[PDB]
Design a protein around this nucleic acid. Structure first.
Ligand SMILES: [Cl-]
Ligand SMILES: [Cl-]
Ligand SMILES: [Cl-]
Ligand SMILES: [K+]
Ligand SMILES: [Mg+2]
Ligand SMILES: [Mg+2]
Ligand SMILES: [Mg+2]
Ligand SMILES: [Mg+2]
Ligand SMILES: [Mg+2]
Ligand SMILES: [Mg+2]
Ligand SMILES: [Mg+2]
Ligand SMILES: [Mg+2]
Ligand SMILES: [Mg+2]
Ligand SMILES: [Mg+2]
Ligand SMILES: [Mg+2]
Ligand SMILES: [Mg+2]
Ligand SMILES: [Mg+2]
Ligand SMILES: [Mg+2]
Ligand SMILES: [Mg+2]
Ligand SMILES: [Mg+2]
Ligand code: NA
Ligand code: NA
Ligand code: NA
Ligand code: NA
Ligand code: NA
Ligand code: NA
Ligand code: NA
Ligand code: NA
Ligand code: NA
Ligand code: NA
Ligand code: NA
Ligand SMILES: [Sr+2]
Ligand SMILES: [Sr+2]
Ligand SMILES: [Sr+2]
Ligand SMILES: [Sr+2]
Ligand SMILES: [Sr+2]
Ligand SMILES: [Sr+2]
Ligand SMILES: [Sr+2]
Ligand SMILES: [Sr+2]
Ligand SMILES: [Sr+2]
Ligand SMILES: [Sr+2]
Lengths: 237, 46, 119, 194
RNA sequence: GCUUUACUGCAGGCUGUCGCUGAGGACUCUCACUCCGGGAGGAGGACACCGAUAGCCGGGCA
RNA sequence: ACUCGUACGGUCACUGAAUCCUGCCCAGUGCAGGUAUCUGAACACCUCGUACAAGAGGACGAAGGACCUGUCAACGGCGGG
RNA sequence: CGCACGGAGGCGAAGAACCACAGAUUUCCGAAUGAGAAUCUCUAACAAUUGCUUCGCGCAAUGAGGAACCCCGAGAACUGAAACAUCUCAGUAUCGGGAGGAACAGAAAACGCAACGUGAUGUCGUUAGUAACCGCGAGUGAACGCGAUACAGCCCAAAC
């Protein structure tokens, strides 16, 4: 047959690429040596094309103008601090060791100094729970208990733009506009609506898959479609 | 279209190649321009 | 570095090279690793010198273990060019050997004894 | 008596034993951070180099080359192929890693000609070989009675034509009798059956 | 051309084993190696990656 | 490549606005988890064999399979008497 | 005073034309090399990679072409087997790299008419469709030797 859509993706052609040239900034945490004496004033609140959530423009003491991942409540004029001895106020970035337990946190690092990996999407947050000299247990937005290094930096507060998922797209055109700002091919044609040559579920006189949908993990690209290594399917039971 | 200096020289040559076989060559050889090119009927390069 | 098991002090190295300079003008010296090795094997070597900046280390690697089973005393010099200048060459030398000293026999004997005390 | 050279030789008979085991463990850390072809002032194996034709003279260059370990880096067939020709994984190349190393060295030095090469070890993913190259245009070599043969016009690109030592061995030309029916005088004259 | 529990194979995935690979049937360490850090340094660590081989799955492809 | 992206994400599929709803079946097939025991290759190891080798057998036993469980908005099924 | 027999005119005994050898001139693009460009342009140029080095592009090298031949790598399928998978077509077609006027090979860790024998290597004739391979099917297929051609033997590493 012909290569399936998921295989065309990997080649990284224009249709599948993200409009990177239209993106604003790669929202990472600032680099401090030690001492904490790095603070800044919020100049503007901009829209970020990459994540459909707002981003805050901050001007630091040493003359550095950088866009930061905006938590909720952060406005123009507000002073944000980045470092070890930073104040435990929403919008400040300090390592997990210095942040008290039971406090909602965002833009958490995986490895110390990476700039932030977890809890970055609209309105989500990570929850810092247990402390130790070796481990800081953080509960990520998926409900997973992630054991991290207490030296991993994070920003206090929930991410801004909460409740975006609450309002329906209503029409196809609204989806179109959102998708044009992302690295995704849209609309989605069902495999079951294609020809046998194009997809494992293609063909037939009527529309239905040709085999069961639950495919093995060991399946090769071109065959790994439908329900990938499903532990279970359905709602009931 | 916009022609470059070189393209202009080439078009110039093609126009010159389009002139007839002089009257005296007919008398010297005692009796055909095989490269007769029209602007509409024929096509040049580039 | 891999063949070096002891560090020789700057003062002892100064003494050693000065003793080598008067060994070429009076007695006899062998210049170059091949000639130093044959000096140890034949037993004619009184004191053998080895440079520490030899790249590759293979060229000189064998001198310590060979000199130990032939009873020949050895001393490490930090630089290759200093050993070559001491032997009387325009070029450097990875290894040199004093094949029977001369008017330095007392000094060489002290250097041999100072090295054994330094393991 | 034994030469100093014989001790470099004896050390290299077992590169995983003795002082050499420690030396290689150290050197390879620096080598892995080095390039594909690195010119070195002095050969790692003096005995082997001199034995192969090296001289501490002007116009004699040495270079360490790293080539990857393993079989062929082959692409799977994009058209109709019978089962016998459908392989990817078990296919190995006909030229050995030493020969690949020599060619990569000769490309880096377009003016020089390959004299010979030798192995200087390997780790888990790559092999290192040191290639002795010669300048056919330097008068220091043109007057050398032992090396001036390499200056001749027919010795141009000798490595790319298999005229090198590792070339001739890989071409199956070692044996003068039985087994070399399809190798001598050339693989091509014998219909590529060698 | 297309399908599949047709025949035979080939990629790919999973898994054991050998090499890289080191010190003191479960374990400790650090020095290779990997990743994070601008750096200092941190995490991991003889595993993983990679090379080789073996068993299983394998119309994704011939 | 996705990705100047991080689960309110994005990948892979099915169904196809709203409204009222979406029953029963896990035996087969698929996927997934488990597993006393059974089966399960090669290297190393043991026995036999060979002045060596081929080779024969053994011991150990990974994934996988047997076996057990979960799962149908997973492929599908919902009859005769 | 070309092909090319015209008109006008000119050159040639100051020996032209014409031919041989040697030299002068030899635009621009082109490996194309200061940089860019559909043969042009912009403000001193071995660009790039190398060797030597007075460490300065100072001295050199490479690049690209050529009818096929040659050498080193990558390597099909139609086809044959009256199907087809091993096999065959075939190491062929085609592809990548490279030399020369020819290439390659070459002075035995050879042969093994087993010898009290031969004596570097190509190649030609033969050995022979022999030995050998092979769903032991279809097919595949040498060598030693011999008769010829031409003949040529040497240099390092190490010991000292
Ligand atoms: Cl979306
Ligand atoms: Cl070459
Ligand atoms: Cl004979
Ligand atoms: K075929
Ligand atoms: Mg970012
Ligand atoms: Mg788009
Ligand atoms: Mg659709
Ligand atoms: Mg259709
Ligand atoms: Mg299909
Ligand atoms: Mg339908
Ligand atoms: Mg349907
Ligand atoms: Mg006109
Ligand atoms: Mg030939
Ligand atoms: Mg990195
Ligand atoms: Mg098929
Ligand atoms: Mg130019
Ligand atoms: Mg047929
Ligand atoms: Mg038949
Ligand atoms: Mg054949
Ligand atoms: Mg024979
Ligand atoms: Na026209
Ligand atoms: Na070259
Ligand atoms: Na063969
Ligand atoms: Na068709
Ligand atoms: Na069932
Ligand atoms: Na000319
Ligand atoms: Na040049
Ligand atoms: Na220069
Ligand atoms: Na037929
Ligand atoms: Na057929
Ligand atoms: Na066959
Ligand atoms: Sr990032
Ligand atoms: Sr970064
Ligand atoms: Sr279908
Ligand atoms: Sr249900
Ligand atoms: Sr027209
Ligand atoms: Sr020197
Ligand atoms: Sr060339
Ligand atoms: Sr509905
Ligand atoms: Sr089931
Ligand atoms: Sr002869």
């Amino acid at each position: 047959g012909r290569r399936i859509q998921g295989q065309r993706r990997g080649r990284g052609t224009s249709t599948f690429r993200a409009p990177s040239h239209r993106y604003k900034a790669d929202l990472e945490h600032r680099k401090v040596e030690d001492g904490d004496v790095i603070a800044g004033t919020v100049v503007d609140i901009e829209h970020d094309p990459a994540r459909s959530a707002p981003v805050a423009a901050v001007e630091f003491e040493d003359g550095d103008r950088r866009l930061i991942l905006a938590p909720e409540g952060v406005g123009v004029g507000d002073e944000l601090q980045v470092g070890v001895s930073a104040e435990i106020a929403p919008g400040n970035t300090l390592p997990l060791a210095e942040i008290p337990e039971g406090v909602p946190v965002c833009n958490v690092e995986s490895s110390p100094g990476d700039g932030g990996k977890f809890a970055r999407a609209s309105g989500v947050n990570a929850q810092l729970l247990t402390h130790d000299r070796n481990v800081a247990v953080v509960k990520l937005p998926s409900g997973e208990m992630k054991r991290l290094d207490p030296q991993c930096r994070a920003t206090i507060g929930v991410v801004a733009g909460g409740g975006r998922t609450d309002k329906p797209f209503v029409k196809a055109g609204n989806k179109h506009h959102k998708m044009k700002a992302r690295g995704t091919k849209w609309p989605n044609v069902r495999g079951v609506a294609m020809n046998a040559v194009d997809h494992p579920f293609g063909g037939g006189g009527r529309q239905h898959p040709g085999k069961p949908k639950s495919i093995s993990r060991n399946a090769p690209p071109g065959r790994k479609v439908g329900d990938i290594a499903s532990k279970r399917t359905g709602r009931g039971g | 279209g916009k022609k470059s200096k070189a393209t202009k020289k080439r078009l110039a040559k093609l126009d010159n190649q389009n002139s007839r076989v002089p009257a005296w060559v007919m008398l010297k050889t005692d009796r055909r321009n095989h490269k007769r090119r029209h602007w509409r009927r024929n096509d040049t390069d580039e | 570095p891999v063949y070096v098991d002891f560090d020789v002090p700057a003062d002892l190295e100064d003494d050693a090279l000065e003793a080598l300079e008067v060994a070429r003008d009076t007695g006899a010296v062998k210049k170059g690793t091949n000639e130093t090795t044959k000096s140890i094997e034949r037993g004619s070597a009184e004191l053998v010198f080895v440079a520490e900046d030899v790249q590759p280390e293979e060229i000189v690697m064998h001198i310590p273990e060979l000199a130990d089973e032939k009873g020949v005393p050895f001393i490490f010099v930090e630089q290759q060019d200093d050993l070559g200048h001491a032997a009387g060459l325009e070029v450097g030398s990875a290894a040199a050997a004093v094949t029977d000293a001369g008017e330095a026999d007392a000094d060489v004997e002290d250097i041999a004894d100072k090295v054994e005390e330094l393991r | 008596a034994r030469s100093a050279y014989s001790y470099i030789r004896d050390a290299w008979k077992n590169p995983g034993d003795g002082q050499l085991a420690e030396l290689q463990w150290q050197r390879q850390q620096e080598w892995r951070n080095e390039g594909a072809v690195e010119r070195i002032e002095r050969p790692t194996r003096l005995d082997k180099a001199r034995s192969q034709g090296y001289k501490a003279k002007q116009g004699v260059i040495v270079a360490r080359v790293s080539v990857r370990k393993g079989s062929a880096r082959k692409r799977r067939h994009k058209a109709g192929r019978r089962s016998k020709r459908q392989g990817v994984t078990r296919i190995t190349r006909r030229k050995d890693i030493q020969r690949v190393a020599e060619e990569r060295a000769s490309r880096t030095f377009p003016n020089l000609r390959v004299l010979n090469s030798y192995s200087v070890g390997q780790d888990g993913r790559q092999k290192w070989h040191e290639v002795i190259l010669i300048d056919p245009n330097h008068p220091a070599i043109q007057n050398d009675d032992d090396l001036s043969w390499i200056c001749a016009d027919d010795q141009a690109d000798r490595v790319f034509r298999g005229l090198t030592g590792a070339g001739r061995r890989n071409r199956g030309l070692s044996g003068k009798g039985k087994g070399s029916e399809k190798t001598r005088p050339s693989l091509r004259s014998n219909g590529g059956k060698g």
